Amino acid sequence: NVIRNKQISAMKLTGVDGKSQYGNAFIIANTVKHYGGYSDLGGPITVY
Amino acid sequence: YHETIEQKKNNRLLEARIFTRANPQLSGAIRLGIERDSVSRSYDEMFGA
Secondary structure: OHHHHHHHHHHHOOOOOOOOOOOOOOOEOOOOOOOOOOOOOOOOOOEO | OHHHHHHHHHHHHHHHHHHHHHOHHHOOOHHHHOOOOHHHHHHHHHHOO
């Protein structure tokens, strides 16, 4: 689903200081869908 | 000559591999099983859209 492809891969990114992000506390959207625009890109998926 | 032809074949496969996953048509319930390769990102950072 949406949770897998984007929300995990956002956490997989290294931090601005570097690195890992593993073991950190996140806050993520429960469900995400496409609203609109010129095209349906991969879509900005945000993880805090 | 053989190495030149083999380079031509491999580059053709690499271009086809990138376009297959980049196809907007596969979004898509099949999108659930599509992963972006590391070579794909290098291509996109180079050739843009």
